[PDB]
């Protein structure tokens, strides 16, 4: 019912719908980077697609994504991530039983 | 093109969205309408949900949808539904192959 609750649930509910679509065995191709820059634009956030070694592949809003939420990812974190306000949210994507990047919301 | 395309890509996308959000086993429940509530808001789209009878069951701006877009969706018609110049797009919603309802979108 809180304003933040609501805003932390939308973008979970964002970011996982987002990985469900990716290709995760398959990640720097360009099917997937016109799926992240489309759904971009449409659901009103900025996402990004990280490898495992912390580089950023594509985003919707330019191949960028904020240098302490990588590496909260690549050191195991996900879900929403520890700015300071400005919200974000991180996922792991595994193709075949082994991890092959993530992606990184960010709301906008 | 190409303002219009963008705001049609963009009701797409969000129309996909939110019809992956719904049970569709259930769609006349209160989880559901919340999700509607919630993410119509978070999306500044109107969107509404209508049973496979045309009735409306609830929407993010009130329990309404355009008669005739209605009855193109029970008439089997999806995509871009878009009358001259108000932009609608449409799913169906489906639980085990069946048909539940639909899903109506208008911009906002």
Do not use: C, F, P
């Given at each position: 019912?809180?304003?933040?609750?609501?805003?932390?649930?939308?973008?979970?509910?964002?970011?996982?719908?987002?990985?469900?679509?990716?290709?995760?065995?398959?990640?720097?191709?360009?099917?997937?980077?016109?799926?992240?820059?489309?759904?971009?634009?449409?659901?009103?956030?900025?996402?990004s697609?990280?490898?495992?070694?912390g580089?950023?592949?594509?985003?919707?809003?330019?191949?960028?994504?904020?240098?302490?939420?990588?590496?909260?990812?690549?050191?195991?974190?996900?879900?929403?991530?520890?700015?300071?306000?400005?919200?974000?949210?991180?996922?792991?994507?595994?193709?075949?039983?082994?991890?092959?990047?993530?992606?990184?919301?960010?709301?906008?």
């Amino acid at each position: 019912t809180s304003d933040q609750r609501k805003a932390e649930e939308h973008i979970e509910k964002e970011a996982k719908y987002l990985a469900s679509l990716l290709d995760a065995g398959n990640l720097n191709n360009q099917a997937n980077e016109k799926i992240i820059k489309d759904a971009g634009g449409a659901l009103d956030v900025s996402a990004s697609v990280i490898d495992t070694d912390g580089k950023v592949l594509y985003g919707s809003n330019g191949r960028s994504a904020d240098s302490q939420k990588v590496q909260a990812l690549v050191s195991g974190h996900e879900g929403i991530l520890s700015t300071t306000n400005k919200l974000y949210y991180g996922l792991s994507l595994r193709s075949e039983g082994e991890k092959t990047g993530y992606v990184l919301l960010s709301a906008s």
